């Protein structure tokens, strides 16, 4: 390993996660993933909590007891 290789592995991981999160990759990134398909497949062998809905409390009691 080396700084250079660390950079590559990190970029591959980020790009794969970014695509998984639903964002499109650029043309150079798609190319990058091809150039390092080895690292990609290497990692390929290694989310939620979004639009949660909130209820509205419509109840309104009378007064006293």
């Amino acid at each position: 390993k080396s700084p250079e290789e660390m950079y590559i592995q990190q970029k591959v991981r980020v790009l794969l996660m970014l695509r998984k999160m639903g964002s499109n990759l650029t043309a150079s990134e798609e190319e990058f993933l091809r150039t390092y398909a080895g690292v990609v497949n290497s990692q390929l062998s290694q989310i939620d909590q979004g639009a949660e809905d909130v209820v509205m409390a419509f109840s309104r009691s009378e007064t006293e007891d």
């Binding site: 970014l18 990759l25 989310i47 949660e52 809905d53 419509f58 109840s59 009691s61 007064t63 007891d65």
Partner: protein, 512 residues
């Protein structure tokens, strides 16, 4: 005269004479004159009250209870019964196997509860609540209608009574009535009791678990508007605690139909109930979309105009329906096909208040997930307005609750919607042209994790274009983005790293 003698006879030790004295009195209470003579004699009324709660002869208890019933038609009669300790005796009679006695007893109590000052406390103290709930298993619908109305009067504005009703199993008994009988007056009176109990934090869950939502739903198409409205109000009060209920198909289908009503109260309630039931329940979301809920909700919004008591819950329902379920994508597209985009974007402007604006922004964010909505949303002027709202809300957070909404929520919501809209190249140009990059970079410093996420997110989308990536770097985004790299939030860390990679990719070739 007669009264004095009859009174004496009722107190006689020979049981055979009292029974004969009871018939005479009961017979006399059926005539105006003699009736008034009876109610004006404290001794007579007291004797009747004693004879009733002591006799063991069916006909005697029936004639005494019947006499009291007749007297209860008048103000003086009600007072005399009250003062003679008649309430405790009447409550005791609620345990009589004789229907004739029971009917006279509950009806007399009903007249006291409706008109006699002090009657409610006296009935509660005598244990009338527990007795009434226990009688809910009878099958005479006119008897049940009166009994349930008594419970309504006793429970109204009295938390103590509501809890006693719950402990006695009132919820299941009341729900059973709604599922078992068809008599309109009974259904109506029972729905009113349930409405009173539905605002209580203890009764609400119990009513829902007893199958209350589904039972109330059975009557939403009844010709009786008073019954329909009372069911709708109750359903709405209960709705925030019913998002986990099953077997809601029928109710959901009817609520969607009611959205087309001309009655404002029906429409408002239906929208409110649907808003809560579509909360995090994918089966409910699926069913609502299946029966044309998107089109109906869009129409409801169109017709409501500026009536926020309707548009707010309708918009929230739409937001719930365009997210996290197998048919969300179809729903996102449906809103456009039914001409809903123009009105949704319109709601972002005055006179809309903050709650509705927040819901609308959230809906737009979901609608933007559908590429076919990117251009029309843009063409409706959504982007400059979202940016304006974002800028003002951010400034407010730098200089708490406004109409119940924190401006941090607006910042997060607007940046979130712009994040999705930025997936489109033409939208990116508009977004960037509004000089938003400096702002997005500053939001990177927000202490709110979700704000950091959408700010990094929109910057990431914008960075997919070479020129924009350069402009983002020119804004000193590198430092704040670098700090986000160790965030616990994968999204934040991923978007931040992505912007950094895209910025240092462009030209950055050799060293120096």
């Amino acid at each position: 005269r007669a009264i004095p003698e009859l009174t004496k006879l009722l107190n006689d030790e020979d049981q055979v004479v009292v029974n004969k004295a009871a018939v005479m009195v009961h017979q006399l209470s059926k005539k105006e004159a003699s009736r008034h003579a009876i109610m004006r004699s404290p001794q007579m009324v007291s004797a009747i009250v004693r004879t009733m709660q002591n006799t063991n002869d069916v006909e005697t208890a029936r004639c005494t209870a019947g006499t009291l019933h007749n007297l209860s038609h008048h103000r003086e009669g009600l007072l005399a019964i009250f003062k003679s300790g008649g309430i405790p005796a009447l409550v005791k009679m609620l345990g009589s196997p004789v229907d004739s006695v029971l009917f006279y007893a509950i009806t007399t109590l009903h007249n006291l509860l409706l008109h006699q000052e002090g009657a409610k406390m006296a009935v509660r103290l005598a244990g009338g609540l527990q007795k009434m709930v226990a009688l809910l298993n009878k099958t005479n619908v006119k008897f049940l209608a009166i009994t349930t109305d008594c419970l309504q009067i006793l429970a109204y504005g009295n938390q103590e009574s509501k809890l006693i009703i719950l402990a006695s199993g009132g919820p299941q008994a009341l729900v059973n009535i709604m599922r078992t009988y068809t008599y309109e007056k009974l259904l109506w009176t029972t729905s009113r009791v349930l409405k009173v109990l539905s605002v209580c934090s203890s009764n609400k869950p119990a009513i829902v678990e007893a199958g209350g939502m589904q039972a109330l739903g059975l009557h939403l198409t009844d010709p009786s508007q008073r019954l329909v409205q009372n069911c709708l109000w109750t359903l709405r009060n209960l709705s925030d605690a019913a998002t986990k209920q099953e077997g809601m198909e029928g109710l959901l289908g009817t609520l969607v139909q009611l959205l087309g009503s001309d009655d404002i109260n029906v429409v408002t309630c239906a929208a409110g109930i649907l808003s809560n039931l579509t909360c995090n329940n994918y089966k409910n979301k699926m069913m609502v979309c299946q029966v044309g809920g998107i089109e109906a909700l869009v129409r409801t919004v169109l017709r409501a105009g500026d009536r926020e008591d309707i548009t707010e819950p309708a918009i929230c329902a739409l937001r719930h329906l365009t997210s996290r379920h197998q048919e969300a994508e179809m729903a996102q597209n449906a809103v456009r096909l039914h001409y809903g985009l123009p009105v949704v974007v319109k709601l972002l402007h005055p006179p809309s208040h903050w709650p509705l604006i927040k819901a609308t922004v959230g809906l737009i964010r979901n609608l933007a997930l559908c590429p076919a909505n990117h251009a029309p949303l843009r063409e409706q002027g959504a982007i400059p307005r979202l940016v304006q709202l974002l800028v003002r809300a951010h400034q407010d957070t730098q200089r708490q609750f406004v109409e119940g909404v924190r401006m941090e929520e607006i910042v997060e919501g607007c940046t979130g919607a712009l994040h999705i809209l930025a997936r489109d190249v033409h939208n990116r140009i508009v977004i960037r042209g509004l000089n938003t990059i400096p702002l997005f970079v500053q939001l990177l410093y927000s202490p709110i994790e979700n704000i950091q996420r959408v700010a990094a997110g929109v910057l990431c989308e914008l960075a997919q274009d070479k020129e924009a990536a350069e402009a983002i770097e020119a804004e000193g985004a590198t430092a704040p983005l670098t700090e986000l790299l160790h965030s616990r939030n994968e999204g934040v860390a991923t978007y931040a790293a992505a912007v950094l990679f895209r910025m240092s990719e462009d030209k950055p070739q050799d060293y120096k």
